[PDB]
Design a protein around this ligand. Structure first.
Ligand code: HEM
Ligand SMILES: CC(=O)[C@H]1CC[C@H]2[C@@H]3CCC4=CC(=O)CC[C@]4(C)[C@H]3CC[C@]12C
Length: 394
């Protein structure tokens, strides 16, 4: 029914190639069948907006088939709303700013410290991944190093959530989750005791108060903070750094005026998104204009296909932090499932980049070796760089 295409697993040293490829496809067809994901990809903005809104027709029930079953993302309707309110409490604005003061800022300074005394580093492994890892460590009360040991299992878990029709990816996802459950069980057990003094402890306490603290619910809260809070957040920071490093005049301006960091992050999400969109399951035969989707089909909403719509964002290939209005983020999903941790991720990007920019006025990309970009970078489910080598000193 749909044209076939390979939208995602395509390397380039041009960070805009991904955004431009999706926009190009959207001009050819509203829906394409991706040969690597093995599912229809919705590219048309009105179709995506409809899909996000009509949750009875476009559900997240595909997540009942894999490792997210039992967690928030797999829930629908009232069960979802009820668990969502619980999660919501911990990402309210005041809670976020409490995290910023009490640990994101000190951790950021510590991470930057470890970069001192070296002439060159890779800001991907040594910053973008380090900072979110240590934040989750703080929320768990467990050493960041412990999470670092899970990197490969974490990425294996995520790959199967996207390519959920691929038996090898799904099996490795399930197996990786099994190989991480000892860890997850240890963390849950510790912070579920009355002696817990961690944010995770407070969350488990809240689930307990609502009589929702089943083994699976508690494990899924930890799983989401790892998959989202650590791995997925890393790529947002990485892409924001690449955008600044690639545009040294904008980087200098941001260093001179760190109040611009929110605009740098948002434009970065338009210009170099780390995620394409979301998955939904079609619950009933539906037609979207001339396109028909059959009940039971799993689809991807590629909300980022509009990031490079020139009629919406002129000169879309230009990383312009001064755009008015600032682009609406498409990397957090939509509808009732819109990412609940996004406020934490956005704050970490700002607070970490501030600490970095202030400490190294000489910060610049190593002008030799260029980052290579693709969806699937480093075996992730992100579009991001393979490395971000910089020079820190003049
Ligand atoms: C740059 C960082 C992040 C990005 C781009 C991101 C992206 C996403 C996306 C695309 C979804 C699917 C939404 C949908 O189906 O509409 C999602 C959901 C979710 N994420 Fe985030 N994530 C990030 C960080 C985080 C963090 C830090 C946490 C935990 C603190 C988190 C926890 C969750 C949860 C629990 C869901 C399920 C929400 C629901 O179904 O209602 N994520 N995220
Ligand atoms: C529910 C949950 O833990 C969240 C936190 C991290 C999220 C994911 C983050 C990565 C992401 C990229 C996509 O394109 C599909 C949705 C996914 C695969 C998200 C699904 C749900 C996740 C796994």
């Amino acid at each position: 029914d749909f044209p076939l295409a390979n939208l995602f697993f395509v390397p380039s040293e041009d960070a805009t190639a991904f955004g431009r490829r999706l926009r190009a496809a959207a001009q050819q067809a509203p829906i394409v069948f991706d040969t690597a994901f093995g599912m229809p990809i919705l590219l048309r903005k009105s179709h995506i907006t409809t899909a996000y809104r009509d949750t009875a027709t476009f559900s997240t029930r595909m997540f009942q088939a894999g490792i997210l079953n039992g967690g928030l993302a797999a829930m629908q309707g009232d069960e979802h709303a009820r668990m969502r309110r619980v999660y919501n409490m911990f990402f309210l604005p005041r809670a976020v700013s409490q995290y910023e003061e009490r640990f994101v800022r000190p951790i950021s300074e510590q991470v930057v410290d470890r970069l001192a005394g070296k002439p060159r580093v890779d800001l991907l492994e040594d910053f973008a991944m380090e900072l979110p890892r240590r934040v989750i460590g703080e929320l768990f009360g467990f050493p960041a190093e412990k999470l670092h040991e899970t990197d490969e299992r974490v990425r294996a878990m995520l790959r199967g959530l996207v390519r959920m029709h691929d038996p090898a990816a799904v099996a490795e996802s399930q197996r990786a989750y099994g190989e991480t459950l000892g860890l997850i069980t240890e963390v849950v057990e510790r912070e579920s005791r009355d002696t817990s003094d961690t944010l995770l402890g407070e969350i488990l306490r809240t689930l307990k108060a609502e009589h929702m603290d089943t083994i699976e619910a508690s494990r899924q809260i930890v799983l989401s903070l790892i998959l989202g809070g650590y791995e997925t957040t890393s790529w947002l920071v990485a892409n924001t750094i690449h955008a600044l490093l690639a545009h040294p005049d904008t980087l200098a301006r941001v260093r001179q005026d760190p109040s611009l960091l929110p605009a740098a992050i948002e434009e970065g999400m338009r210009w170099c998104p780390s995620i394409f969109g979301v998955l939904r399951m079609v619950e009933r035969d539906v037609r979207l204009d001339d396109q028909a989707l059959s009940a039971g089909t799993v689809v991807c909403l590629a909300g980022i296909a509009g990031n490079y719509d020139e009629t919406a964002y002129p000169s879309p290939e230009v990383y312009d932090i001064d755009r008015k209005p600032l682009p609406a983020a498409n990397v957090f999903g939509g509808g009732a499932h819109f990412c609940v941790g996004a406020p934490l991720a956005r704050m970490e990007a700002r607070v970490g980049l501030q600490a970095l920019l202030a400490r190294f006025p000489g910060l610049r990309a190593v002008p030799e070796e260029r980052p290579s970009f693709m969806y699937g970078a480093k075996d992730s489910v992100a579009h991001g760089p393979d490395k971000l080598p910089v020079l820190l000193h003049h």
